[PDB]
């Protein structure tokens with residue numbers, strides 16, 4: 001099963017500066033975000049192999 | 050027995066009498082609920098609607114000012130986004146009754162706006178920032194725009210906040226109405242009027258209309274006194290309605306003109322600083338439907354007697370202790386009165 005190396009940490013927005021959320025796991029082929037119950041659009045995700 | 054006056058034999062004991070008393074309490078509460086439900090729902094609806102409408106107006110004004118900054122002053126973003134969000138958040142908070150000072154809102158807004166103007170529009174090229182914040186107020190760089198904005202938004206936000214508070218207090222008093230507990234003697238009189246006829250073995254006998262009138266006038270003694278204050282509350286609200294949206298929408302025009310006014314003296318400002326450092330339709334319809342309830346506390350005993358089984362003919366009816374052929378004839382209330390007095394004084398002094 002996939003083991004998370006870099007689990008997302010609760011971010012805080014300061015002075016309207018958008019802070020992105022990090023996610024790193026191995027072994028992983030597809031990683032998606034489920035923000036507030038629903039899936040996040042494919043365009044918002046930025047994958048690194 | 051202690052409630053049903055025993056003329057002779059009786060079919061009920063003390064326990065059945067306590068049962069009749071509890072059922073009388075429940076029936077009276079249900080009747081008051083049925084009388085107050087429509088007005089309660091109306092005021093709850095309007096409170097929710099106006100709160101949502103005001104939040105929509107605040108959001109619209111917020112990103113209108115955001116769009117005007119983004120289109121006309123792209124060099125001031127994203128700091129402009131931050132202090133505009135802060136200002137409109139504080140505006141929404143003051144609208145929702147929080148302890149917020151309008152003059153302090155405008156002053157913090159302009160103290161945040163001036164340094165980015167100086168660093169990105171007048172002198173393109175951080176730790177001396179507080180000195181610039183001071184120069185905002187010590188040199189009066191924005192002229193008379195800040196006092197104008199202060200008065201314009203303070204008037205509208207204060208009247209809107211008082212309007213929402215008045216709506217909530219109306220909700221509170223109408224919801225207290227159907228929960229009013231009455232005296233023991235009033236309860237015993239209700240038990241005698243509604244159920245003690247069954248203790249005597251009568252099946253379909255209804256109480257006399259005049260007996261219901263005297264019983265209800267004895268019970269609703271303090272409640273009818275609320276009628277004058279409720280009428281004055283309705284009239285003061287109608288006076289107050291006859292706006293927050295226009296001010297919050299013209300805010301961006303005023304801020305843009307203030308920025309131009311500041312830029313018109315950059316020549317000397319940079320040198321001296323370097324040296325020194327359907328809503329109206331909804332209110333109208335609400336007022337028109339609310340005026341139809343100005344006699345709510347005066348027609349309430351009439352409602353209770355007309356919506357209960359009564360012998361309006363006063364012939365072969367129950368007078369409370371026998372079957373006759375012809376009838377012969379505060380603390381919580383004080384709190385409601387005090388709250389009404391307060392809200393009425395506020396509505397009077399506003400408009």
Ligand SMILES: *[C@@H]1O[C@H](CO)[C@@H](O)[C@H](O)[C@H]1NC(C)=O
Pocket residue numbers: 018020043044045046
């Ligand atoms: C995230 O935002 C930064 C700037 O805020 C930008 O450079 C980057 O391309 C953005 N990525 C996505 C996926 O939006």
Ligand SMILES: *[C@@H]1O[C@H](CO)[C@@H](O)[C@H](O)[C@H]1NC(C)=O
Pocket residue numbers: 112115116117119
């Ligand atoms: C209104 O907010 C949206 C949110 O994404 C933004 O795209 C838009 O540019 C804003 N309006 C302006 C500044 O014209």
